[PDB]
Amino acid sequence: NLKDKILGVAKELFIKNGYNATTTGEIVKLSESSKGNLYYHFKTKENLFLEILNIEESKWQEQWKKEQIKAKTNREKFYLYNELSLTTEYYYPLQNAIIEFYTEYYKTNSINEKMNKLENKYIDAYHVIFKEGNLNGEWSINDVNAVSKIAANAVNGIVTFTHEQNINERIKLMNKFSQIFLNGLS
Amino acid sequence: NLKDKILGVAKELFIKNGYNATTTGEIVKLSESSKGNLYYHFKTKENLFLEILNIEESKWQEQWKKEQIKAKTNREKFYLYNELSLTTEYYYPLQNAIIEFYTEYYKTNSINEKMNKLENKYIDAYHVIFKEGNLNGEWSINDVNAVSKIAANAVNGIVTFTHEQNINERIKLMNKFSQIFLNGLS
Numbered sequence: 116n117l118k119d120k121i122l123g124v125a126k127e128l129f130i131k132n133g134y135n136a137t138t139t140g141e142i143v144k145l146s147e148s149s150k151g152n153l154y155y156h157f158k159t160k161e162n163l164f165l166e167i168l169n170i171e172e173s174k175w176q177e178q179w180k181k182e183q184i185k186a187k188t189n190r191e192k193f194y195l196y197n198e199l200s201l202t203t204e205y206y207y208p209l210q211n212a213i214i215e216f217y218t219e220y221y222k223t224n225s226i227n228e229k230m231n232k233l234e235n236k237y238i239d240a241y242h243v244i245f246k247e248g249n250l251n252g253e254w255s256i257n258d259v260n261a262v263s264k265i266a267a268n269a270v271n272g273i274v275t276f277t278h279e280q281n282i283n284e285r286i287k288l289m290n291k292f293s294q295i296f297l298n299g300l301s
Numbered sequence: 302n303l304k305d306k307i308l309g310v311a312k313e314l315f316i317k318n319g320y321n322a323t324t325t326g327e328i329v330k331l332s333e334s335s336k337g338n339l340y341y342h343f344k345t346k347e348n349l350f351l352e353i354l355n356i357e358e359s360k361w362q363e364q365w366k367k368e369q370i371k372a373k374t375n376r377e378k379f380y381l382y383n384e385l386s387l388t389t390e391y392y393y394p395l396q397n398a399i400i401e402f403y404t405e406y407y408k409t410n411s412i413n414e415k416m417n418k419l420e421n422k423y424i425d426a427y428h429v430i431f432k433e434g435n436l437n438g439e440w441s442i443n444d445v446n447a448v449s450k451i452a453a454n455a456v457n458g459i460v461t462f463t464h465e466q467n468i469n470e471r472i473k474l475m476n477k478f479s480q481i482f483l484n485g486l487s
């Protein structure tokens with residue numbers, strides 16, 4: 116599983132030194148693989164990275180699946196998931212390498228394409244919550260996909276453009292948002 | 302021009318590339334000058350940047366007023382500000398850039414001050430719209446600043462993380478957002 120070993124070493128290198136400074140050379144030697152093996156599995160560093168991001172997205176889903184059982188109703192799942200997105204990124208190691216990578220390829224439709232497939236995976240969480248909320252009379256939404264992209268992006272905005280305020284303040288605003296939003300659906 | 306020529310080329314590269322991707326080296330050469338230049342008015346690099354942000358924030362908040370007249374109620378004002386956010390050429394095209402900046406100077410204090418003193422200029426627009434809406438009885442918000450902040454960030458989110466798809470689809474979501482947010486306020 117040196118494909119797996121490469122993803123691992125790469126994740127760590129990226130975390131320690133960021134996207135730009137990490138060279139496939141380091142990855143090659145530290146994972147005891149080769150330029151060729153690395154080329155055959157990911158073709159480029161960008162792809163390698165995107166690959167990691169999907170693995171990460173997967174772990175996040177897996178995590179959410181276990182964590183969402185703490186929330187009985189969908190209203191609750193909405194409140195909870197948003198809180199998680201805020202508190203977890205506070206200490207997500209890849210966070211900084213992602214920003215680096217993102218704000219460096221959002222100009223390439225090639226990379227930008229896959230970047231959306233990934234983004235869409237994170238949006239499904241909402242889609243599910245919303246779909247389920249319907250089938251339980253918690254709310255009635257006839258445009259799930261829509262409200263889903265909206266929630267996703269609104270929430271990511273609160274997580275991304277607030278950092279400085281103290282952590283409780285943020286959690287507070289987020290929960291406030293989760294309230295206002297959920298309220299304007301009934 | 303002298304000073305107001307660098308600022309120009311700067312803003313240009315800060316958007317075209319990242320905050321790091323672009324450096325004084327590039328700015329100087331493409332703005333035909335020397336290093337010294339960038340020192341009396343332009344101390345640090347984050348000085349020239351923090352500057353540019355200020356310019357853009359002002360330009361935007363001004364274009365807003367030279368355009369909010371087209372909205373009789375505040376409910377409409379809210380909607381319009383958010384819709385316009387998506388089409389301007391001011392401030393918002395630097396969110397990606399700002400993100401890097403903040404995530405590379407959040408370890409210092411001279412940042413969480415300007416980078417936070419600008420937050421007022423950023424949420425003011427919503428504060429007025431929400432306060433005035435209270436006097437005008439369109440709604441009743443007793444935690445304006447919270448709501449103002451939550452909105453400023455939710456919106457920035459929708460504008461920033463959808464920036465690469467059908468511009469008219471953006472405008473649609475943004476309106477379903479304004480719709481849903483306002484409906485949750487009462």
Ligand SMILES: N=C(N)c1ccc(OCCCCCCOc2ccc(C(=N)N)cc2)cc1
Nearest residue numbers: 171174175200203207234237267268271462
């Ligand atoms: N192994 C772990 N311990 C771990 C892994 C992943 C993780 O991930 C946290 C992820 C937060 C993701 C927020 C994504 O927000 C958006 C994504 C896409 C879009 C879009 N529509 N373009 C908008 C917001 C946290 C922990």
